[PDB]
Enzyme design. Sequence first.
Site, PDB file in Angstrom:
ATOM      1  N   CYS A   1      41.157 -31.692  35.577  1.00  0.00           N
ATOM      2  CA  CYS A   1      40.443 -30.798  35.909  1.00  0.00           C
ATOM      3  C   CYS A   1      40.953 -29.506  35.360  1.00  0.00           C
ATOM      4  O   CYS A   1      40.253 -28.561  34.779  1.00  0.00           O
ATOM      5  CB  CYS A   1      40.613 -30.321  37.387  1.00  0.00           C
ATOM      6  SG  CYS A   1      42.432 -30.464  38.082  1.00  0.00           S
TER       7      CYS A   1
ATOM      8  N   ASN B   1      32.480 -26.786  40.265  1.00  0.00           N
ATOM      9  CA  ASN B   1      33.338 -27.996  40.523  1.00  0.00           C
ATOM     10  C   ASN B   1      32.850 -28.967  39.136  1.00  0.00           C
ATOM     11  O   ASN B   1      31.990 -28.665  38.569  1.00  0.00           O
ATOM     12  CB  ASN B   1      33.509 -28.673  41.740  1.00  0.00           C
ATOM     13  CG  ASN B   1      34.549 -29.386  42.100  1.00  0.00           C
ATOM     14  OD1 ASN B   1      35.432 -29.733  41.015  1.00  0.00           O
ATOM     15  ND2 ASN B   1      35.145 -29.600  43.264  1.00  0.00           N
TER      16      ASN B   1
ATOM     17  N   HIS C   1      43.813 -28.597  42.482  1.00  0.00           N
ATOM     18  CA  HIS C   1      42.720 -28.781  41.491  1.00  0.00           C
ATOM     19  C   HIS C   1      42.449 -27.577  40.702  1.00  0.00           C
ATOM     20  O   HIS C   1      42.883 -26.446  41.095  1.00  0.00           O
ATOM     21  CB  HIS C   1      41.392 -29.314  42.340  1.00  0.00           C
ATOM     22  CG  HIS C   1      40.309 -29.549  41.519  1.00  0.00           C
ATOM     23  ND1 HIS C   1      40.048 -29.970  40.414  1.00  0.00           N
ATOM     24  CD2 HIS C   1      38.887 -29.549  42.013  1.00  0.00           C
ATOM     25  CE1 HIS C   1      39.139 -30.389  39.896  1.00  0.00           C
ATOM     26  NE2 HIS C   1      38.002 -29.867  41.093  1.00  0.00           N
TER      27      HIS C   1
END
Lengths: 254, 98
Positions: A29, A219, A199
């Site tokens: 990520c 995302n 994240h």
Amino acid sequence: LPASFDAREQWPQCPTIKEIRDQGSCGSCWAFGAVEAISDRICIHTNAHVSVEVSAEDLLTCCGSMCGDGCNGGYPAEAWNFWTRKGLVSGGLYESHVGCRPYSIPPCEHHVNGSRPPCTGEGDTPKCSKICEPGYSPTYKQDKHYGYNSYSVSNSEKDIMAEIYKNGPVEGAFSVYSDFLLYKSGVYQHVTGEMMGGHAIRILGWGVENGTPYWLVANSWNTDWGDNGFFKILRGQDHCGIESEVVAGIPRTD
Amino acid sequence: MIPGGLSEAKPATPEIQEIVDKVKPQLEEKTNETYGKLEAVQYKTQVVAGTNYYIKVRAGDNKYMHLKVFKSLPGQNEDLVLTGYQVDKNKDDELTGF
């Protein structure tokens, strides 16, 4: 300065800003947040003349040890510094063809093969290879796109709106909590949950739903999750640490 | 707030236990062995496009075993799958990203 801002509307000529990537089974990520904002910013900074999907494989496999531990974590402020130092090649290039170094780690959303086991395959950071995976012209050290500077943004709501409106989407990071994987609509706001882990994502604007002021976020988990890929999280308080980790940079040449 | 790392360790629970049992059959055929029960004690989670679980199970004698299980996202469904084991491990190892 505006009440409501969305980069997909302000710079529609830039595919990458409306695109959602699938990160798979590994903790990259940090690599995706960075290369997608960087992708976005290259377009914005050249008026659409150059549209590329900067290489996430390159960031992950060639920054390598210096930016974290590959598929086990890593650092935003480091991914961005490395763009400045050694630059990143492609993994998607516009006018169709195909990138230099695309993402080899299989995805987690889709199903594929024959009966759901989507990811559960390689999930093992491949090696650095200063070669374009064949068929793409030209050469690796020439597809290289560099950054001018990279810097942190301040834990302040306005600087963030001002970094986004003036220069394009940015990178940030927050704390995920089980109630978050449940997200579909509205402005997310953390209430309970086990701390799943940290994240990293892409912030690209702002506005309000009912009364809540939010950040527009992409995302990296594909398009079924949430809102066709995206969500909204509480903006104002540094809720889950979303203001504390903002990093950007400005593309070199343009 | 390591943005891709594994959470600090959490004492196991019956959820982490329902996993080790759901993927029991899956570990079974890969080592070809037969266990009366894998008994989880430690675990870490990690955010990917899903959550990976790094579980610490007990096998036969006094030596533990490590297990990476991918866990789907509500959207897709509740899946599970051994993506990688780590048989023949020590009684006291930190759970480590693999």
